[PDB]
Structure 1
Amino acid sequence: DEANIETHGMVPMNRLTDDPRWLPAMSERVTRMVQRDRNHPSVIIWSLGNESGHGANHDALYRWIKSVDPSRPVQYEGGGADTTATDIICPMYARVDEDQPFPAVPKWSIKKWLSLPGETRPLILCQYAHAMGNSLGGFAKYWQAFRQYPRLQGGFVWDWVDQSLIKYDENGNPWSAYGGDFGDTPNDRQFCMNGLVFADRTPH
């Protein structure tokens, strides 16, 4: 269960989440969620949001949850996937054997990540294997690694269903549309369709 906090378009990504003036607004997004969902057994882990860098607001909120609900781990991927705001190493799109050593926020091979000096946390990818179009090549490589390494405990595939929308042609026949098909611009075109299933639930 994840708070409705994502500030991906900011520059740098944590510009708001490291800003105390935004702590109140962010706090209610996390606190109100826990207040509502904390009795559901299906929720096993809380998340502080998505792609909002790593800011001090995150640290404060991570502690708040740990204090009010010790029954479930808290994770958050922003800022490098392994900051002080996450009980779990939860990278997005980290590769199995190949490192992608981006500055400040590298995406290490998952097998290697587990063993960096001083690291001891479990690793569960928050997003992996981007099912956009003809894809999922390399999927088995993740599973073989998850089964061999105890601390590689899986992941959440990206993602379930294509976000395509239905439009109607001149003849009234329906068709699947994506970014820019409504005159929207700028837009990110087909990147809104990354699911294992089509928008109507037919499997890819």
Structure 2
Amino acid sequence: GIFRDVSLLHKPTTQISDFHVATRFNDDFSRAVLEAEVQMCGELRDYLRVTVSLWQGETQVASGTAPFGGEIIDERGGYADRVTLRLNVENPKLWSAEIPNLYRAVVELHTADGTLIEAEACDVGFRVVRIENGLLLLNGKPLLIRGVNRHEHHPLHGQVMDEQTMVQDILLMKQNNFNAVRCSHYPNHPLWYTLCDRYGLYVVDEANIETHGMVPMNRLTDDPRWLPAMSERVTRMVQRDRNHPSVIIWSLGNESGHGANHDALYRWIKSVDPSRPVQYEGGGADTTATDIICPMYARVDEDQPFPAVPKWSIKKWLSLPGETRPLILCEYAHAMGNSLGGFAKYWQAFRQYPRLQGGFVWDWVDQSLIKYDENGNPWSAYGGDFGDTPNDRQFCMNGLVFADRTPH
């Protein structure tokens, strides 16, 4: 169905068609350069200007203005319909999940005398995410991901999310010492990223690609006839969500094997957005399409030698010959019912080993639905209770909280 919002947008004829923000730092994060790249569409005029202003609450921190016309990039010239503005920020307040310091960037398209055509705005967090020496660093410090997987689920409305349930989830996550959320396994509603900017949660943004049911699992993702369909799902996610400071890691999807389409889309993201690592689990969690070893349900001390995709123990996995990447479990500690036995063994290992940087618990909320029996009394239904066949019964309910957000 139509499960998210429908809206109408009226734009002027000459308009801002796209804008990118990127933050670049010195060695001790005392000087930042906000590089803003604004694109227009419509008819170019020489009186058109772009002002990018940066605001910390009510005070204005930086500002720049420029006419259109980019730098020369090749033999044919540059982009006549693009600008790049570089704003110097001295001692910026850095964004993290601990302290979610945000700035407000306002992009004004206006004429040279000064009448405004259109303004756009986004929240800006100064943060750098990079992998050096095998460690995922945020602002020069190694992260420990206290993460949880979260589906968009409401027991009455299905997959329709409103703001009040999102705020209820984020408060319960931070009150239970979570600092990260994995968007499993699709891009969320756009308000979710804004709220994770505001309250402070790291977000793994994940493309809407899963072909778990295929035999073999990479039957579509190793086929170049499906590369246009897969690329749209990746490129339009990155184009929608690249300005959010809470998004720190891109994910190529879930459980799609490992085909050549993943390697191509991995390298596409590293080209357009070098500021975020890319992870991908399929094909054994340590393929060339991932910056981070991200196994699903690998154990702490026990190996699981499956043919061609073994799940090593996470302590062994780090020490395999030639292996240098950090390890962050994209799913671990499957919370199905009365579960999370041995959860302390993961967190003993996370604190002991530097390259084990945590993981994402599967998962946040039970996907149970509400039915009514005969007296109008509601009851929680799982797979099979709607006549669906075949179904997977109670494997839909893996949450740390019930569907009405009361805790397990």
Q: TM-score range by the shorter chain?
A: over 0.9
Deviations 1:34-59 (A, max 9, x none): 00000000000000000000000000
SS state at 2:284 partner: coil
Q: Give the Å deviation of 1:86.
A: 0.2
SS of residue paired to 1:45: strand
Shift of 1:181: 0.2
**Partners of 1:139 and 1:80 in 2: CA distance:** 23
1:73 and 1:166 mapped to 2: Cα distance? 39
Q: CA offset at residue 131 of structure 1?
A: 0.2
Distance 2:276 2:319 in 1: 24
- 2:231 is aligned to 27
Aligned partner of residue 230 in structure 2, secondary structure: helix
1:5-24 to 2 correspondence within 5 Å? 5-24=209-228
- Distance in 1 separating the partners of 2:318 and 2:307: 19
Runs of 4 or more off by more than 2 Å in structure 1? none
TM-score (norm 2): 0.50
Q: Which has the higher strand share?
A: 2
Quick one: distance in 1 between partners of 2:259 and 2:401? 35
State the Cα distance separating 1:138 from its structure 2 match.
Answer: 0.4
Residue equivalent to 1:175: 379
Structure 1 residue 73 displacement after superposition = 0.2
Task: Give SS of 1:117's match.
Answer: coil
Give the Cα–Cα distance (whole angstroms) in 1 for the partners of residues 365 and 300 of structure 2: 24
1:65-106 CA deviation, whole Å, 9 max, x = no partner? 000000000000000000000000000000000000101000
Give CA deviations for 1:95-149 in whole Å, capped at 9, x if unaligned: 0000001010000000000000000000000000000010000000000000000
Q: Which runs of 5+ in 1 are unaligned?
A: none
* Structure 1 residue 22, shift from structure 2 partner: 0.1
In structure 2, C-alpha distance between the alignment counterparts of 1:200 and 1:95, rounded to whole Å: 31
1:33 and 1:133 map into 2 onto residues whose CA distance is: 33
Per-residue CA deviation, residues 167-202 of structure 1 (Å, 9 max, x unaligned), is: 001010000000000000000000000000000000
CA RMSD of aligned residues (A): 0.3
Is 2:322 the counterpart of 1:118? yes
Secondary structure of 2:206's aligned partner: coil
Quick one: distance in 2 between partners of 1:187 and 1:36?
A: 34
Quote the Cα distance in structure 1 between the aligned partners of 2:324 and 2:262.
Answer: 21
What SS does the corresponding residue of 2:403 show, helix, strand or coil?
Answer: coil
What does residue range 125-136 of structure 1 map to in structure 2 within 5 Å? 125-136=329-340
Counterpart CA distance in 2 for 1:154 and 1:68 is 27
**Separation in structure 2 between the aligned mates of residue 122 and residue 79 of structure 1, nearest angstrom:** 17
SS at match of 2:328: strand
Write the mapping of 1:1-204 to structure 2, written as runs, cut at 5 A: 1-204=205-408
Give the distance between the partners of 1:58 and 1:186, measured in 2 at CA: 30
Distance apart, 1:161 and its partner CA: 0.2
Q: 2: distance between equivalents of 1:161 and 1:77?
A: 22
Offset of 1:26 from its aligned partner? 0.2
Matches of 2:328 and 2:393 in 1, distance apart?
29
Identity of paired residues, percent?
100
Q: 1 CA distance for matches of 2:376 and 2:244?
A: 44
Q: Distance in 2 between matches of 1:8 and 1:177?
A: 24
Instruction: Give the secondary-structure state (helix, strand or coil) at the position aligned to 2:208.
Output: coil
Count of equivalent residues: 204
* Cα drift, residue 163 of structure 1: 0.0
Unmatched 5+ stretches in structure 2: 1-204
Query: Which has more radius of gyration?
Result: 2
- CA distance in 2 between counterparts of 1:62 and 1:46 reads 9
**SS of corresponding position for 2:247:** coil
- Residue deviations 1:3-57 (CA, integer Å, cap 9, x gap): 0000000000000000000000000000000000000000000000000000000
Give the distance between the partners of 2:319 and 2:311, measured in 1 at CA.
14
When the two structures are superposed, what TM-score results if normalisation uses the length of structure 1? 1.00
